[PDB]
Paper text:
Six additional cocrystal structures of [name] bound to the product (cleaved N-terminal side of the substrate peptide) were also determined and comparatively analyzed. Our cocrystal structures captured the N-terminal product after the cleavage reaction was complete where no covalent bond exists with the catalytic cysteine. The N-terminal products carboxyl terminus is coordinated by the catalytic dyad. All 6 cleaved substrates bound at the N-terminal side of the active site superimposed very well, defining a “product envelope”. There were no major rearrangements or shifts in the backbone and except minor side chain conformers, the products bound similarly to the noncleaved substrates. Overall, the product envelope recapitulated the consensus volume revealed by the substrate envelope for the N-terminal part of the [name] active site.
Residue numbers in the entry:
A (entry chain B), D (entry chain B): -6 to -1
B (entry chain A), C (entry chain A): 1 to 302
The structure:
C-alpha cells in the first residue's frame, strides 16, 4: 500500500 | 535502581503546541516566538496527495486560509512561507511560553522524546530512536503530524523531529525542524519503502551495561574478543560495525562496572549465537537497541 | 499506527514539584495549594532508619527545620503534621500552578505515569503498572522519594502514588497520596519481601488486541475456549483468573477487531503452552501485561 | 539485604 500523510 | 524507557519531561514543549487548520485538513504546529511551524501538507486536499505541487498549492493560499488556535485563543496569521517541507506561519503574538530552544538534526542511533499531539492538544509522551534507515518506530494516528521529537539539556529544548507521515510498514518518517526529511522519503501518498534496517550495536552494549549495573549478570563470561573478530559476528546478525569511537563512548560504563568493552562484546557474541535460553535481561527477551550510552548514564547513577 | 509504552504529558505535575530538606536528608515534595506533601522519612537521620519512631522524631522538629525550595524560591513552612506515612507542610504561598486534582487509590493491574524527580527537579517520565503484589517496577535512585505517579482525565490530575523506597529485589514501594502504603510494606530499612507476583491476564489480552489492531495476526487461530477451561490454564502459568467482568471490559476491543474474547483466550492459551517460536508481538518476545484495556483504546484509534 | 528509603 501507499504512505499516509498524517 | 530499575531501568525504563524514559522520556524527558514534556511541559516546556506542551506550551508550544497549537492546532493548524487549512480547509478540511487539521494538524499540529510548533509555536516559538512569533512563528508557527507545521508540516506543509496541511494545505493539501484529500485528492491532492498523490503528487502535490506544494509551490502551486501555497501560491493559491493567503494568510486568512490558515486557522491557528492556541488552546481556544485564535492566533492571527500575518505571514506565510515554505521552508522545504514545513511552513512558517508568522503570527502577531509571540508565544510567552517560548523556551530556550535549538534546531538540531540528529544521527541514526540517537534517541529523543516524542510528544504526540492531536488538534493542538498533547496526548502522550514516549521515547524513540532514529533507526539506521531513518525511520522511527513510534505511535501516530491521523492528525498527529506536527508533533515534535526533542531532547532537553540544561534548560534548552533541542528540537530534532517533526512528524509527517506513516510508511506502509507501520514505521514513521518526518523532518528536522528546518523541513528536511530524515531519509529518502517524500511527503506524498506514494508507495515508499525504507531500506533494510540494522541493529544499533553500541546501544545494545550500553543496555547490557545498564543490566550489569542493575544486577543482571548471567550473560557475562570470562572470555574476551578483538574488535575485528567481534565485527565479523556483527555483520552476520545484521548488526552495525563497532568502531574504536564506540568503545571510547562506552568507557565510563566500562569503568563503573569493571567490565572491559571487548569483554562485554564476548558476551554479546555469545547471546547472538546461542540466544538467551529462556532468560531475560531487564525484563526483555530481546536485545534492546534504543538506549544510547548517554541514556544509560542519565538514568543509572554511579 | 504503532504501539508504545506511553506516559501522560507531565507539565501539570512538573509545576507542583519542590525540594524538601530536613537536616542532611533531601527528597521531593508535591506542592498543591498551600500544602507540600512529602514522605515522612525526610525527618530521619541515617542512623534512625532501622526502626524509626516517626511520632517522636516529628515532635522534636519545628517549622524552621524544614527547608522547602520551589526552584530557587524558598517557601516558608508555617505548619507541619503527619498523615500516616506522609507529611503535610503548610506554607504561606499557594502554588499558582495548582491543577485540578484528585487523590485516588488505584488497584493492582492499573497503570499510571511516574514523574521521576531529584532535588525538586523533574528528570524523566515513564509508565508503570501496580503489580498484583503492590510493588511497581520503576526506575528510582536515592533522592527520588516524593516523586508521584498519576493519571490525567480531561483537565484533572488524579494522583495515585508517591514513591518512598526500594525493596531488596529492585522493585519499588510507595503510598497513595493520603500516606497509606500500597501493600504490606513499611518505611523502615528492614528486610522486607513482596509476595509472589502474578501476570495481569486482562492486560495481556488487551495487548493482544492492540497487536491485532496494528497488523500482528500470526497468533490467531480458529479455536475457542470456555472461561472455565481457560482459567485452568491460567492458574498453571501463574496468571490471574479471568472474570466475566474482564470479558465485558474487553468488549469494545473485541468489537473493533471482530475477535471474540474467548477466541482470543484460545490464542493466549496457545502462546502459553507452545511459546512464540521465535516470533514477536509488537516488538516483544514476551507477553506484556502493563497495558490496561483503557490504555489500548487511548492509543489505538478505531 | 534490606530495603532502602530513597
Amino acid at each position: 500500500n501507499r504512505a499516509t500523510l498524517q | 535502581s530499575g531501568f525504563r524507557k524514559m522520556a524527558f519531561p514534556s511541559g516546556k514543549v506542551e506550551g508550544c503546541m497549537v492546532q493548524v487548520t487549512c480547509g478540511t485538513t487539521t494538524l499540529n504546529g510548533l509555536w516559538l516566538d512569533d512563528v508557527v511551524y507545521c508540516p506543509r501538507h496541511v494545505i493539501c486536499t484529500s485528492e491532492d496527495m498523490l503528487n502535490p505541487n506544494y509551490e502551486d498549492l501555497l501560491i493559491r493560499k493567503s494568510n486568512h486560509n490558515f486557522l491557528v488556535q492556541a488552546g481556544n485563543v485564535q492566533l492571527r496569521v500575518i505571514g506565510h512561507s515554505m521552508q522545504n517541507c514545513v511552513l512558517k506561519l508568522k503570527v502577531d503574538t509571540a508565544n510567552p511560553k517560548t523556551p530556550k530552544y535549538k534546531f538540531v538534526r540528529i544521527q541514526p542511533g540517537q534517541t529523543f522524546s516524542v510528544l504526540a499531539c492531536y488538534n493542538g492538544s498533547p496526548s502522550g509522551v514516549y521515547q524513540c530512536a532514529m533507526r539506521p534507515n531513518f525511520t522511527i518506530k513510534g505511535s501516530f494516528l491521523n492528525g498527529s503530524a506536527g508533533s515534535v521529537g526533542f531532547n532537553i539539556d540544561y534548560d534548552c529544548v533541542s528540537f530534532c523531529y517533526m512528524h509527517h507521515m506513516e510508511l506502509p510498514t507501520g514505521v514513521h518518517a518526518g523532518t528536522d525542524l528546518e523541513g528536511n526529511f530524515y531519509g529518502p522519503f517524500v511527503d506524498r501518498q506514494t508507495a515508499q519503502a525504507a531500506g533494510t534496517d540494522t541493529t544499533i550495536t553500541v546501544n545494545v552494549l550500553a543496555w547490557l551495561y545498564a543490566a550489569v549495573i542493575n544486577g543482571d549478570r548471567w550473560f557475562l563470561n570470562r572470555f574476551t574478543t578483538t574488535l575485528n573478530d567481534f565485527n565479523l559476528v556483527a555483520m552476520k546478525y545484521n548488526y552495525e560495525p563497532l568502531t574504536q569511537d564506540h568503545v571510547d563512548i562506552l568507557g565510563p560504563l566500562s569503568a563503573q562496572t569493571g567490565i572491559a568493552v571487548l569483554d562485554m562484546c564476548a558476551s554479546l557474541k555469545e547471546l547472538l549465537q546461542n540466544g538467551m535460553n529462556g532468560r531475560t535481561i531487564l525484563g526483555s527477551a530481546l536485545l534492546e537497541d534504543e538506549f544510547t550510552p548517554f541514556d544509560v548514564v542519565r538514568q543509572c547513577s554511579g
